[PDB]
Amino acid sequence: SSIAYSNNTIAIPTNFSISITTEVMPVSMAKTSVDCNMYICGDSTECAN
Amino acid sequence: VGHQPYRVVVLSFELLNAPATVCGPKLSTDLIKNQCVNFNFNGLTGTGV
């Protein structure tokens, strides 16, 4: 882009536009639970001990 | 005794996901379903429904 710097010269907008943009934000994640007894030695009494 | 004869038998076992040919003398029971039981199928043991 070329922008021309000069003294004693300004640029003034003669019009406008209404813009609507969208912003997506995470706020949460999956709540997970682990029954560690089931995960390791799940059905074994000896392992549980 | 170090020079005396000795008879040697080496038993080599295979435990695959295949039908059982040689089995222990453990006695079988009836099936129980829909209950939390200890089970033993062809020597593969566990706990479950």
| Residue A46 near chain B (CB below 8 Å) | no
Give, rounded to a whole angstrom, the gap between the first and last alpha carbons of chain A. Answer: 73
- For this PDB entry, the determination method is cryo-EM
- CA dihedral (A32, A37, A43, A47) in degrees, to 10, reads 150
Q: How far apart are CA A13 and CA A33, in angstroms?
A: 58
| Residue A43 near chain B (CB below 8 Å) | yes
| Residue A44 near chain B (CB below 8 Å) | yes
Sort out which chain B residues have CB atoms less than 8 A from A44's CB and list them.
47
Using DSSP, state whether B17 is helix, strand or coil.
coil
